[model samples]
Target chain A: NMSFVKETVDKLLKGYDIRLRPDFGGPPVCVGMNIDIASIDMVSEVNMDYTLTMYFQQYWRDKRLAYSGIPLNLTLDNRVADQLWVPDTYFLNDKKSFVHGVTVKNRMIRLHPDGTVLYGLRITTTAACMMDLRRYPLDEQNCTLEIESYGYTTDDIEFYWRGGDKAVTGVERIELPQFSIVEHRLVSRNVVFATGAYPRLSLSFRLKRNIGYFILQTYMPSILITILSWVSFWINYDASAARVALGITTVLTMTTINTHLRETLPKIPYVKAIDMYLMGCFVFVFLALLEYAFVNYIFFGRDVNAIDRWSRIVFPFTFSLFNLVYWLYYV
Target chain B: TTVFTRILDRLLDGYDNRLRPGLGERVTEVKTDIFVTSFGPVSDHDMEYTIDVFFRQSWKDERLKFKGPMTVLRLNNLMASKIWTPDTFFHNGKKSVAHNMTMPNKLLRITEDGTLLYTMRLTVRAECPMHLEDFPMDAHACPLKFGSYAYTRAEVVYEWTREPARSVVVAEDGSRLNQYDLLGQTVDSGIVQSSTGEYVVMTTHFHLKRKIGYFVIQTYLPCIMTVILSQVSFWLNRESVPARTVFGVTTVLTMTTLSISARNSLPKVAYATAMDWFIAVCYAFVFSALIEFATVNYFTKRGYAWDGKSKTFNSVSKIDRLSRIAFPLLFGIFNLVYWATYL
Candidate 1:
C-alpha cells in the first residue's frame, strides 16, 4: 500500500518542478526566524558550557508554486516521510551538544492553498560562548546568545526577526547551582554578504554566583574556630593537657580548613578575596596557641593573669577591627 | 533654493556629500536599538557581552534631495549610492576587532528637506573592563564610548539618539537588580583633547546595582545559625569530655569544610571580601567553646567529678557558672551589635 501510494503520487506529479523560488525583482527573499526559549540549563563554570532548550519557528513567503483548488472539508494531509519538498536550513555555529538530536522527527513542512509555505524545527543547542572568571564567584557574568542563518545571503534570502515588536519571547527563569541571573540584554545584528552572512539575534543574560553555601561551609566554621581559640584565655594558666590539646588541635584544624578551601577552586597564580580572611583567622588562633608556651613554659614570660586579661580584651576587639577593615576594602 | 533642489534633480542623481554641496560639517547623529543577548562572566575585573546594536545615522545633504512623485517620492529612495557616506569608529572598542556590520538592505531615505538616514545592524561580542571592588554589595558602571577617527570635532560631530541604559538584567554577588528597576544610563558628549587632532567622543555609562538578598540568605544567615547552634555544648556538665570534644571537633571541622565549599566558586583575588570576616569570627566562637570545655575539664580533673556516662549537666563549677552568664551575654550582645554595625 505504501509503495502504491508513492507510485501514484510520483506518477501524477512527474512534470512539476519544485526547485523554483518566488521572484518579484524589487527585493530578494526575506527569511524570518523566531526563537522562544523554553528553558536554560547546564550553565557550567568549569567547561564554560551553556545549553539552551528552545523551539524556533522560521518562515518565508514563496510565490512560485500555487494550488488554488483545495479540498476544504476534504482536509487531506501530506506525508513528510516519503513524498515532499523540503528546504535546507541549518545552524551555522555548533559545539558538543548540538549533534544528532532527541526528537523523533528533525524537520517538518506545511503548505497552504496560498503560495506561502512554512518550515520549522525544534532543538537544544550549545552556543560557543567564552567565559572570563577573573572575579570568580564575586563576579557577574553575561552569556551571549546568538542564532544565524546557515547559507543564505542578504540578497538570496534576507533574514528578519518575527516576534513582531517584542522579539524576545517565552523566556522563563533560569537556575544555576553556582550562579543566578541579574540582568539581560536582547539585540540583533546584520551581516556583510560578501560571501554569505547570516543574520543574528543576541540574547545575553547577566548572572552572579550564589555565596550562601560558602559562608556556611567556609567562613562560618572559621569564625567559630576564632572564638574557640580565644577560649584558651579563660582556661586556668597551667592546665597543660586540656589547654595544650585545645591549642594544637585548633591551630592545625584551622590550617586544614584553609587547605580544603583552596583545593576545590581551580589552580591559579593569583591572590583571592577569601585568602586574607583565612590567614587572619589562622593568625588569630595561632597566636593564641603560641601564647600557651609564652605564658606558661617560657621562663621569661610575664605575669600569666595580666597576659590573659589583656588578650581577652584586645584579641576580640582587634579581630573585629580587622573585620571592619576587610569589609571596607573588599565590599 | 537651488536650481537642482527645485527642479531637474528629480530626473538625475540624489544627494552627494563629497562635493560639500552646501552641506555643513556632516553631523552624524548615532542611535541604536540595543538588544542584549548575554552579559556575563560577570567577573570582578571585567565582563563580556553579545549585543545586537541597530545603528542608524542621519545627516543632512543638500545635493540628494529631489522633488519627484509629487514632492518626495520613494523613487528617490531607490537611489542611495548617489550620496557620500562618512567614516565612523567605535572609539573605546577593543583593538582591531570590528563587530559584524550588515549592509543597508534598503536604500537610504531622503526626506523632502535633505536629510539621509544611514542604517546598519551590527552584532558584537564585545568585552569591557570593570571593577567589582564592592562585589556582591556593589554597583557597577560600565561605559560604552563611540566617536570618529578620520573627522575631528570640526569636520563631523557625533550625537546619541537613545538612552544607553534602557533595559538590561544586571546582577552582582548572587543578587540581581530587577529588569524594570534598572540603573539607567547617562549619555555624555565631549571632546578628546589629543595632539594629532581633537576628536569628539560620546560616552554612555551602563549602571546596575547588585542585590544583597541572595547573599544574605545564603552566606550570612546560615553562618549565624551555625555559630549559635555550636554554642549548645556550653550547657553540658563539666565532667563530660567526650560530648564536649565530639561537639567541638565536629563543629570546627564542619566550619572548615564550609570555608572550603565557600571558596569553591569564588575568584582568587588578592583582596578579601566581607565574607572572610564573617567566617573568621564564626570559627572563633566554636574554638572558644572548646577552650571553655577544656578549662572546665581541667578544673574538675581532681575534684569530685561524676563519671562520663551521665547524660544531664548534673554538675557546675565556679568557671562554669561564670561562663553561663558571661558567654551568653557577651555572645548575644555580639550577635546584636556586630552585624548591626558592619553588615
Candidate 2:
C-alpha cells in the first residue's frame, strides 16, 4: 500500500523550481541557480540536468510587447548531484521573432517519504550572441525587455526564484571597458512555483552609439590639427618670411576647416577635443612665426651685423632639426 | 679790299690779340643761355630730365629774322640717360655742310618764329654709367661778311633748363647715341652749328626709378610669407603644458603682426584668403592641443575610483597606466580619422 501511494504521488508531482541568475562576463553567458524540491520520497535518484523554458516580450513606445522568436539554449549541472536534477528547456515561442529565446529539458528529482525536500542548483546559459547594432540611431533611450518562466509548480508550500519578470529588482549600473551605462533592467528566474524549482530567464536590450561616436569624432580632428601646426617649426629661418607666411595662412585655413566641420556635427555643451587641438596648433604656428621673425630681426638688426653670420648658418639648421623631431612625433 | 673785309680783318686781328682759341675760346659776348625749366635729380631706379633754351637777339643784327636759319643745341654726357639722346642742333632751315659737321648729335627740330625751339628727354635707367665731364656742347660759326664780303663771328654759352620733353625717345641704337653712351663707347665727336643762336643745356633724371620697384615688392612678398608662417604651431608637444600653451599664444601674436604688415600694403577686404584660412587652422591646432593637455591632466587626476575599484593604490596605479596609454592612443586615433577625411 505504501509503495503504490508513493508511486502515484511521485508521478503526479514531478515538477520542481530552478532559480537562475545571469552573470555576464567576457563571453559565453554564465548564470547562478538554486533548486528546491517538494517531497524527497517522490524520486529515488535525481539527474543533474533539467529543461527550462523561458518567455520574453520586448517593449517599445509605438507597440505593446513585441514578440521576438530568437531562441537561447543553455545547459547546467547540479550543484549537489545527489538531490533533484533538472535540464534546460525549449520554449514554444519562435526563435527568429524575438531578440532572445531559450529551451531547456531533462530534469531529475529526489524526494523522501515524509515530505522533506533536498535542493541543488547550477549555473549555465546560452553561447555568446553578437547582435548587428547598425539598425537603430545611436541616441535612443528607455527600452525594456521582459522575461518570464512557464511549466511546473508546488502544491502546499511555495518557492520563489529571481530572474526575468519574476526578478522585479532593477539594476543600478552596468560596467563595460571604457564605457558605463546607467540604464538597467530587472531580472528574474522562476515565475510559477513548480516543484520549488526555478526556471532560467533571459532578455535583450538595445544600446546607443552616440557616446562612442562623440569620443571618436572629438579627439581625432584635434590631434591632426595640432600635429599639422607643429610642422611650422620645421621651416628654416632663412626662409623666415616664407615660414611666417605659411604659419599665418595655415592658421586661417584650419579655422575655416573647423568652422565647416562644426556645422556637420551636433553641438556639445562644452568645448571639445577639436577646439583644444585647433587652439594649440594656432599657438604653435604663431610661436614658430615669432621665432622666425626674431631670428630675422636679429639678422637684420641695425646694431647687430655680426649676428647675421651665425643666424645665416644657425636658423635653417635649427629649423631642420626641429622639423625632423616634429615629424617624428607627427608620424 | 672791301670795307666789311677791312673792318673784319681789323676786328679779327684785335680779337686774336685779345683772345686765343688754343687756350680755349673766352666769351667775348654771351649770346645764348639754356635753362632747366622742369627737372629732377637721378633716383636709385629710373628718372627723367628736361630743359629749355633762350636765345638773345642783338639790336644790331646782320641776319634777318626769316632770312637765315637759327639753331639751338643741348648736350648731356651723364650715363643715366641711355634711353634718350641730346639734341646737337635745332635749326630754322637746313644747311648741307653745317649739318654734316654735326654728325654725332641729331637735329632736334625747327621753329617758325625767329627763335628756334627744341626739346629732348628720355627714360634714364639706374644701371646707366655716371661720368659728368665727357659731355660736349654745341659749336657755332657765323658768317661775319655777308653776300660779297661775307664775314662771320660765333660764340657758345652753356646753362641748365627746366622744360621737360613731351615725346620721350622710346628707343635708340648706338648710331644715334646719347652723350653718356657716346662717352661710354669712347666716341669723342663734337656737335657744331653755323648759327650764333646755338646753346647747350645739362639736367638729370632721378625720381622715376624709385616708384617702379616699390610697387612690385609690396604686392607679392607678404602674402607668401603669411601662409608659410602659420603652420609652425602644430609641431609642438601637446602633452607638455608649457609647450602647448606657448605655441598658441605665440601664433596668435605672429598672426597679428603679419596681418598688420599685410594690411599696410593691401587694401582691406571682407573675405579671407587661403592665407587667412591657413593661419586660422594653425591657431586652431594650438588651441586644441591646450584642450587635450588639460583634458588628459583632468582625467589623470580624477583617479580610478570612478571605475568602482576599491583599492586606492590599484586605482591610482590604474589611473597612471590609463593616462599614459590614453594620450598616445587618443592622439593616434585622432590623426588617423582626420587624415582619412582627406582621402
Candidate 3:
C-alpha cells in the first residue's frame, strides 16, 4: 500500500546511530553548502558587527538512508532532525547567532532515495567584522561569513562550495542598512587552529561604505568652516572686532566639530583619512586666527594691509593644495 | 490531508480569483494584524523608516464553507494560488518586498467554515514626512497605512483585529530604533476618501521622540560654549589689543563654523528653524562682544589724547564693564525664550 513511505523512513532509521558521522572510517564526507542571503539588518559602526539573515543550505550523501521503491522524496519535520546525523557546522566569527522560528522551527530536511540529504536552515547572526577604517566613509570593508566543522577536522569532514561560481546567491536583493555590497566571492580552504586543521568554507562580501551621509554630516561642514576662517583676512585692520570675531569663532567651532565627528567613530590608535583632512582644516583656521594677531601687533608703523593681503591668498591656495593632495591620496 | 485535497477541489471548482468574496452583496471585511520582527534605521536624511514584519489578513468565504471532521487545513503556495484573497497596498510605501529566501515567505490556512488566513513576511520602506523645524527636539508620528487596492469601500473593507491595540505585536528586542525613543504605538481603522471611491484603511502610528543627547553634544553645547568663549574678551584688559581682538575674532568665526556644522543635521529648508534662531542669537552675542571691545579701545585712545596721565590707571573701561553684564543678561533671556518656544 501507500504506507510504504512511512515504512521506508522507519526501516532506514531503526538501526542508524545519530551520534557518529554517516561513515565512521570512510573517506571524508563532502558537505556542499550554498547560501541565499535574505537581508542585511544592519552594518553597525558602533559594534563593528554586521547582522544578516540568510537561508543556509547544506547537501551531503549518506549511504545508510538510501532506498529505491518510492519515487517520492521524504520531507521530514525539523524535530526529527534530532534523530539523524547532521554536520557539526558552526559559524567561526559569530558574536550572536540564532535559528529563526516563528510559529514553528524554521528548518527543513529533505531525504532522497539515492541517499542525498538537503538540510536547510534560516539563520540570523551578528558576526564580528574587524574594520580598517583608514578611509572610513570612503572605505570598502571585507566581511567574511566563515563556516567550519566544530569538532571534525579535515580528515573527518571536508566542505566544498556547492554551486561553484553561483554558490552564494541573493546579494542583489539584500537591502543593507548602511553599506552596499560591491561584490562577493566564495572560498573553500582548511583553517589551522590549535586543535587541528579544520575544513572551512568562507563567503566574503566586499561592502562599499556609503559616503553620502558623511559628506553631508562631516565633510561639508568642515569645508565650509575652513572657508569661513579665511573671511577674516579681508576685513580692514582697524576693525579688530570683525577680524578677531571671524578668526576666533572659526577656530573654536572647528575644534568642536572635530570633537563631534570623533564621538561617533571608534578611537583607534592610528589616524584615519578623515583625521588628515580635519587636522589640515584645523591648522588653516588656526593660522587664520594667528594672522589677525600678527596684524594687530604690527599696527603702528608696519603696513598691516600687506600681511592681510598675503593671508587672503595664502590660506585659500594652501587649503586648495591640501585638498588636492587629500582627495588624490584617499581616492 | 487527502480529505482536505478533496475539499479544496470542490471549494475551488467555480472560484474565480478576479471576483472578490461576497461580491455585489455584503462587503468582504478582512481583519488585519502585523507582527514587527525587525524595525530600525528610521532615516532622518531620507525622511523614511524601514521595517520587517509579518503581515496577516483573514477573511471568510461563504462559498468555500463546509462541514468536516478536520477543523483546519494549511495550504502550500501552489494550492493557495487557487483561492481568492484581498488586494492590499501600502499608502505611503516607497519600496517593499515580500521575502523569498528558499521559497516565498508566505503561509495560507483555511478553517472548516472557510475563514482563510493569509500571512507573508515583508520589508517595507515608507515615506515619513518629518518637520525638522524643532529637529533633535522634535517628535514625529510615522504611520504605516494599508488599504484595499482595487476594491472600494462598497466591495471590501479592512478592519483591525478585535482588541486593535494588541493586534499589532512588536517584539521588544527588535523595536529599538537609533537616535529615537518609541513614545507610543496606536492602531486605528478608518475610511479613506478618494476621487474615485472611498476605501477602508488600517493605520499603525509609531510616535517617535528623538533623543537630544547627540544634538546636545554635537551642536548645542559646542555653540553655547563658543558663545561663552566670546565673553572672555569683556573680562580681558582692553589695552592688550592683540589678545582682546584675537579672542573676539575666535568666538565670531567659531559661531559661524558651529552654525554651518549644525546645518548638516537638517534638510535645506526655506524657513528658519528653532536651531537656526538659537545659533543666530549666539552669532549676534559673539559679534557684539567684538564690537564692544573696539568701542572701548577707541574711547581709551581718546582719553589718552585728552590726558597722557590716563595710561597710568589700568582699570577696566566703562564699555568693557557694561558688556560684562549686558552680554550675559541678553543671552540668558534669549535662552529662556528659546527653550520655552521649542520645548
Candidate 4:
C-alpha cells in the first residue's frame, strides 16, 4: 500500500529552507489576514487597554508546497508546520499576549493544491487602546487590533485584509453590560517605526458605552439628589434650622458621592459629562446655602419670603437648562 | 481504491461501542479541555453559575489505530456512534443541555495514531455553593468537575490538557459576566471516592470576582446619602420644633426604604453580609441623629424658661450644636472602619 500522504510531505519539504521567505528577491509576498474574534474579555478605561481572543489566519501562496496528485487538500500536523515558512506577524500595541496551547498547541495549517497555505492560530492579547473619556460613560471608543510584520519590512512582505470588507467577524455577538460593540471595519496601512515602514492591517471596533448602567447608577441618583436639595426652597425663611440643615446635608451628600464615584475612574484633568452634572448640582446646593446666608446678612436676619419665592423657580429652571445642555451635548 | 472506506471498515470490523479503550492493564488517559463560549448569570440566591462551553476530550484507542494515505478521518456523527466514548458527567451540575440546532453541535475526528478527539458544545448550570458573607465585595470560586460516570480510576483516568493554563480556555468576552469578572482559574485533576468506585476527575476552578459598579451606584451611594440627609436635622435650630421633627422623621423613613430596597436582590441568608452590616450601621447613625433632635426638642418644650441665661436653655442650644459635629464625625469614622474591614 503506497502512502501518497507521506510521499507528498516528503516531496514538499525535501529542500525547502524554513529560514528564508518565499520568492526571496522577487515580488513582495502579499499575505492576506483575517480574524474571527472569539470574545472581548475586557475593555478597561483604567488601563486604556482591551483584551481579546481570536482565531487569526494568514493566507499566502507558496510555490514549493503546490502539488498535482491524487491527494488534494492536506491538513498537516503541527509538527509538519515547523518546516514551513510563515509570516512574522505581531500585534503593534501589545501589552501582553500568548498563543493558546491545550491538548496540543491551538494552531493548524491547511494547504490547497493551488499552493495556498492557510496558517491559523488562536491568541489572547491585551493591546493598548488610547481613550478619550471627556464624555466618559456617555462616550464611544474605537479600539483597534493592529497587526504588523515583526521583522519583514514592506519590501519583503505586503499585507492585505484577506476578505477585504469582510476581513473581521464576531464583534456583533459580544454582549457587555457596560458597552455594546457598535461596528467594526478593516484598516490597512503602512506604519512607520524606528526601524522602517511595515505593512499593517487592523480591525477596529467602535464600542458605545451602554447608558443604562450609568443612568441607573450615576445619573438618576445625582438628579434625584439635586432635586432633593430644591425641597429646602419651600421652607419658611424664619425656620433657619430647617433651611440650613437641608442645604448642608445635600452639599455633604453630593461631596460624598463625588468622592465615591471618582474612585472608579482614573483621575484625569478634563471634566467629564458626569462631572458637569455633578458639579452643577454641587454649585446649586451650595448656592442654596449661600442664598440663605446672603438673605440673613443682607436683610439683617429678617423674614425674606420674596427672595425665597424667586429662588424656588430660578434653581429648578437653571437646573433644567443644565440638564438640557448636558444631555444634548453628551448623548 | 477507496481509501476512506478502506480505513473505516478496518477500524470498526469487530469494535464494540460499549467497551472502553484498553480492556486490560492499560488505563485510558482522557485529556480534557473546556473552551468557554460564555459564562455567568452567577446568582447569589441560588449560588450557581451558568456556563456555555465547547467541552473537548481526546483519548487513544489502540484497536482503532490505522496506517494509510489519509492523515486523519473526520468521522460523521453517525460513524462516531460505532466507536467507544467516555461517559463523562458534571459532578455538581444542576442542569445541562447539548446544542442541536440544524443538527447536533458535535465534532469527532480520529488521528492516524487513533487519537479519538470528541468535542461537544454544552451549557451547564452547576452548583457553586458561594459564601455571600461579603456579597457585592465578594469573590467566589466556581468549579466545573467532570469524570467517568461508570469507569473506575483503574480503568479510566481523566487529565487536563498538557498546558494547564490553556486547559480551561475562556473566550475573549468570557471574562466579564454581568456583575462578575473572571479573575483567574485553576485546572487540576484528582481521584474521587464514590459509591461505585474511585474515578479520576478533572476540575476547573474559575475565580469569579464580583464587580461592585452596580452595587456602589444602586445601593451604597443612596444609603449613604440618606444617612447624610438624616444628619441635616442635627444642624437645624433647636427652637424650630415642627421643622426639626418632620426633617428627622422623613430621613428615618428614607433609611427604612433604602434598607428594604437593598435586600430585595440578596438571598435570605442567616449571616449578615457586608452590605447588611453597612446598611444596619447607617440605620443606627440616622436613628441616633434623629434621637438627638428628639432629646433637644423635649428639653425645649418641657421648660417654660425664656430668659435665655439658665442652664436648661443653654444646654438645648448646646445639644444641637454638639450633634452637628458628632453625627458627621462618627459617620465618617464608621465609613473608614467599614471600608477597611470589607475591602
Candidate 5:
C-alpha cells in the first residue's frame, strides 16, 4: 500500500526543484475558479464577525504532466511532495485573518487527464460584514463576502461563482434565531490588488432579522405596562393609595424594562422606533397618573359627579388615541 | 470675468485635465464607504456628538493604467508617490483621532491605460454639533462631510458611488453595542464655495435618535416620582409638621438632582427646550408643593399654639383638602399646556 504511492511520488519529485516554478504544460493559469460556502456560523454581533468555511475548485490545464499507470483521476494529501503552479487566493474582506483563520483539514489536490488542476481547499475564518441596520431589530442587513486572487491577474486567472448565473448553490444552512438569510448574490469583477488588477468574486447576502424577538421581548411588555397604568383611572380618585400605587409601579416597571433593553443595544445618538414606543409609554403613564390626581383634586370642588364621569372616558380615549398615533408613526 | 484672469484660467483649464487621463470629461470619483463603529460621549458639555467609524476610501485613477491581465504590479508602496490619486478631507469634522494609520493588508489595483484602484481604511473619531432642540428626546442627523484637499469639482467630484449619495455602512457589532440605538443613515451631496471657487462634497448623515431608556430612568421618572412623593404629603394628616417638612425637603432636593442630571444630558444652553420645560414644571410642582405644605404647616402651628391642640377647621383642613385637588390639577393642566406648546 505504501510503496506503490510513495515510489510514484518519489518519481514525480525526481527532477522537481522547489526553488524553481512548477512548469505547467501551458502558460501559468487557473482559467476559472469557483467556491462553495461549505459552512457559515453567525458568530458575534458586536464585532460583525461571522464564521465562514469555503472550499474552492481551481480549473487549470497543465499538459506537461500526464500519468498512464496511475488511475484516471488521482488525489493526494499535502504530505505528497507536489510541485505545481497554483493560484494563491486571499479573502479581501476577512475581519481578523491573522490567526482567526483556522484550516481544519489539510488541503487536497486532485489531477485530471486534461492537465486541469482541481484544488479543493478548506479554510474557516471570521469574515467582516458591512451591516446596514437602518431598521436594526426590524431592518434587513446585507453582509458581503469578497474573495480575490492573492497575486494573479485576470490575464493569468479569473473566477466565476459556481453554477454561473445561479448566484448561490445552496450554502451550508446555518441557523440563526435572530436573523434569516433572505437573499444573496454573486458577482465576478476585476478588483485592484496592489498596482494590478485581480479577479474578485463577491458573495453578498441580505439578512432580515426576525422581529418576533423584539415584538415579544420589547414591544408587547411595554404596551401591556402602558395599558396597565391606565387601570388607575377606573379606580376611585379618592383612593390615593391605589391610584398612586398603580402609577408608580407601572412607571418604574416601564423604566426597568427599558433599562434591561438598553443593556442589549448600542449607544446610538438618535431615537429608535422602540424609543418612540417607550416615550409613548411614559406619556401614557404620566398622564394617567396626572388624571387620577386631577380628579382627586377637583372632587373636593363643585362639579364632582360630571367630572368623575368625564375622567374615566377622557383618560382611556386620549390614551387609546396616543397608542394609535404611536403605532402609526413608528410602524 | 476679469479680462486678464479669464485667459489665464482657460489656459490653466487646458493644462489641468492633461495631467490626468480620461477623467478630463468628468471629475475623479472617489468612492467612499463609511461604516459606523460606535457612537459616544454625546457631550452636553461640548454640545457635540462623538462618533467612531471605520471608513474606506477607494477610487480609480486612469493615469496608471496597465497593459494586460496576469500583470499585477505590487503598488501598495508606490501609492504614496502617485500624484493623480484620489484624496478627501473631512469638511464637517471638528476633531478626529490620528487618522493616518493603515490596516494590515493594503492593496492597490491598476489596469492598462493607467486605471488604478486604491483602497485605504481609517478608523476616525469625529465630533459633530449635536442638536439638542428636543435634547434627550430629540433625534439628530450627524453629518460627516468629505471633500478634496487640492482637487476641485472639475478635477475631483466628491461622491459616494451615488450622486444623491447612498447607504451608510455599519459594522454589525459596533452598532449593536452602541449606547444609542441605530436608526439609519443618509448620504447627500453639496458644493461649498470658498475664495478659491467651489468644491464638490459628500455628506453622510448618521441619523440616530437618543435612547429614551437612560433619560427616562435618569431624568423623567426620578423627577415625576419625587414630585409624586411631594404629593404624598397632601394626603397625610395636616397635623404633623415634621412629616410634611421631610417630604417637602426630600422632594425639593431630588428635583434639584433631576434638573441637574437632566440638564447634564447636553452642554449648557442658555435657552430652554421641551425637556427643560418638562423638568422645570416638575420643579415647580415639587417647589410649589413645598410652599403649599409650608403655608399649611405655619397656620396649623400658629393655631395649635393658640388653641393648645391641632385645629381641623379653616386652619389647614379646607386648604389642605382643597390643596390635594389644586396641586394635581395645576400639574395636570400644566402638562396639558406644556405639551400643547412644546410639541
Candidate 6:
C-alpha cells in the first residue's frame, strides 16, 4: 500500500503546477477609494441632492510577497488608486496626466518584520472630471456613462511578471472597455443615451391618413373607369346616323378618358385591375358598335322596301331588356 | 318725278290684265308632300320656296327684250292658302284699279315651250266687282282688251331634268297619267327667257295630300327600339362579373354610339332632343343595371345574408334567389328613375 501511494503521488505531482493556475486571472485589486460626484460634477449642479459611492477589493498573489511590497510600488493619477510602477514605465500616449505618487501611510507593513502576515494600505484620490458626451456626433443625447478606469502598472515589471515569472505580481493598467450606445431625443428637454451595459431597445411607428391617401390614389381611378363603362347601354342599334355617331363618339370619348387617366398614372408592368376595367369598357363599347352593325344588317338585309321587322320588334324589346339588365346590374 | 312714275307705270302696265273687272281667278286646291328630316313639331315656316323664270317679248322692228321672273312662296295655313294680286296696273301712262284675290299658292310655273320652272310663289288675281251688280271701274279696263296675258304654272319641279321645255311635258305627262309620280299634278305653265342664258319654263304641281297620322309613328320608332335593346341585358346570367360587366358596359356604349351618330345629322346644340332624352334615359337604365350587377356580386361574394339567412360560403350560390328578384326590382327602379329624370 505504501509503494502504490508513492507511485500515485508522483503521477499526480507531474501536472500539478499546470493545474495550479487560478481559474480567474487574479484576485481583485483593492484601492479603498471613494468617488464624490458632487465635488467634480460638470453635467449638473452640485447639491445635497447628489450622492456618491465607491467600490474596492484587496488582491494579492502571495501573502508574504504582498506584505514585503518589495517587488512593486503604488502610484495614483486622477481618481484611480493601486497603480504599480518600475523602471522604464511610460504613460499612455492619449493620457492627459501621468501618475504622480503613492503616499505610503504604513511603511511598517512594507518592511514585513514578521515572516508572513496581513499587509494593510489605504488609498484616496480626487474623482475624475465628468465629460459632456453631447460634444460627439453620436452622443448628442447626453450619455449616462462617463469616464472610468482600471488600475495601472509599470511596463518592465508587467513584462517580467507576465513573461518570466509567469505570475501576476502587480496590477496592470487597463482602460475601461468601450461599448455601443443608443441616444434618443424623446422630447425637446429630454434626451437619453442608453449605454451598452443595459439591455437593447426596440422602436417602431405606424401609418396615418397621409399614407392612406397615397394608397387611395393608386386604387380609385380604376374603380371609376370600371363604373364609367355603363355608359354604353344608352345607344340605339339602328343604322340611323344617330346610332353610328353615338357608337363612334362614345368609343372615342372613353378612349380619351382612358388616355387622360393613363397620363396621370405612373406606368407599370402587367395590367392593373383598373386597366382591365378600362379595357373591359372599351371592349363593351366596341361590342355595342358591332351590335349596331348586326342589327343594321338584319334590318336592311332582304329588301330595301321591306319593313324593318327586326328593328321594329326586336330592337325595341331588346333595348328595353338592355335598360332593364344594365340598371339592374349596375345598381 | 315723271321718269320715276314712268318707270313705275311701265312696271304696272304688265299687270293691266290682272286688274280687269268682272273677271275672277280661282284656285281649287293646294297640296304638298313632306319628307320629315327630323323629329319635331314641323311648321309651314320651315318650308322654303324658290322660283326662277325666263321671259322674251317681241317689240317692233326686230327689237326683242328678255326678262327673268323670280318669286317666293309661303304656305301659312295647313291648306297652303295665300293672297294673289297684281301689285300695280297701268295703261296709256295711267294706273288702274288693284284687285287682291285669295288663291291656292302655286309652287311651280310653266311656259308655252313645255319648259317647267318650279316657282315657289305665283300670285294670280283677276279683276272683280266690288258689288255683284255693278262692274268695278278700273283705269286699264276696255270693252276689247288688246293685250294678251298668257299664264301657265305647275306646283312641283323635277330636279333631275336638264331640258327646260321637255321637263314641263314630263311633268304634264306624269300628272295626267298619275304614273307612280313623285312630282305632283300640273297646275300652271309659262314661257319666259332672258338675253342671258337663263331660259326656263316654269310649271307648278299640286302634291298628293296624306293624313298626318303616320308622323308620330315614324318619330317614335327609334325610341321604342332603343328601349328594347337596353332591357335584353337582364336576361344574361351574372356568373362572371366580366360577362355581366361587359354586357352592361357594351350596351351602354352602343347606345351612346348610336345617339352620337344620330345626332350628327342634326343641328348641334345644348338642349336635349326627343331622341337625346330617350337615349339619355336608356343610358341611365344601363348604368343602373351595371350598378346592380356590381351590388349583387358584392353582396354575394361578401357572404352576406341577403334574405336574412346565414351564409356559410362566400360563393354567389347562396344569394342567387335574392339576386334574381333583386335584379329585376333594381332594374325597374333604374328605368323609373331614368325616365322620371329625363322626362
Model 5: share of real contacts kept: 0.03
lDDT by residue (A1-331, candidate 4, tens digit) is 2487779778888867554567654577899988888988988775567899888888999987898775567888876776787776766555567777788888889999889999888888887676777788789998887787755668778999887798888877877777888788788899764335779888888988888777888788788888888888787666566776787667666765766676666543345677777766767776776677555433432346678889899999998998898789887
TM-score of chain B of each: 0.67, 0.26, 0.91, 0.92, 0.77, 0.33
How far out, in Å, is residue B287 in model 4?
1.2
User: What is candidate 6's lDDT per residue for A1-331, written digit by digit as tens?
Assistant: 2233224324423443431222225542221111111111112112111111111112223222222222322111111112121112121112232211111011111112222212222112222223322211111222221222212222101211112221211112111111112221111111123421211111111111111221122223233333342232332233255445545656775775566442123233333334544565566556656656665776545442232333344444554465466435432
Q: Please give, for residues B1-343, the per-residue lDDT of candidate 2 as tens digits.
A: 1332242233224232222122243432212222221121221112112111112111111111222222311111111122222123332112211111001111122122323222222111123232211111111111101010111223333222222232111112111111111111110112333454433322222212112122212222232333333222233222223433444455455444544443332224445533344335444543444454455446543322222122232122333345445544554464465335322
Per-residue lDDT tens digits for candidate 4, residues B1-343, read 2345556677889988877887786898898888785674576788787777778888998888888755665444445667788899999999887644212456576788888778776769899998888877888899989988999999998887668887777767543255677888998888889889998888889898877765765568767766876775555456656666666776676666567666667788999899998999988988888788777777775333233232344334687778778888989999998888888
What is the CAPRI rating of model 3's predicted complex? incorrect
DockQ of each: 0.04, 0.01, 0.09, 0.05, 0.04, 0.01
Report the lDDT tens digits of candidate 3 across residue range A1-331: 6587779888987866554566654578899998998988988765456898998999999998898988878898898777777776766555567787897888999999899999999999886576677786678999888787755668778899887989888989887767888899888899774335889888889998778888898889999999998888877766666766677667777777786677576533245688767777877877776677667655643466788898878888998898898898888
Could you give candidate 1's per-residue lDDT for residues B225-245 as a string of tens digits?
446545655554454466467
lDDT by residue (tens digit), candidate 5, A87-117: 5555655643322223434466777655566
Q: What C-alpha lDDT values do all the predictions have? A: 0.56, 0.30, 0.76, 0.74, 0.59, 0.30
Stretches of candidate 4 off by over 4 Å are: A1-236, A240-329, B1-3, B301-316
Q: In model 6, which regions exceed 4 Å deviation?
A: A1-253, A256-331, B1-230, B302-343
Q: Which should have the higher lDDT, number 4 or number 5?
A: 4
Number of the predicted model whose lDDT against the real structure is largest:
3
Give the range where candidate 1 chain A is weakest over 10 consecutive residues by summed lDDT. A72-81
TM-score of predicted model 4? Answer: 0.61
How many backbone collisions does model 6 have? 100
Evaluation by lDDT, superior candidate among 1 and 6: 1
What's the TM-score of every candidate structure?
0.48, 0.21, 0.60, 0.61, 0.55, 0.24
The DockQ-based CAPRI class assigned to model 5 is incorrect
Predicted candidate 2 versus true structure: per-residue lDDT over A252-320, tens digit per residue = 555444444545543221233334444444454445445544544443223233443454445456545
Query: Proportion of native contacts in model 1?
Result: 0.00
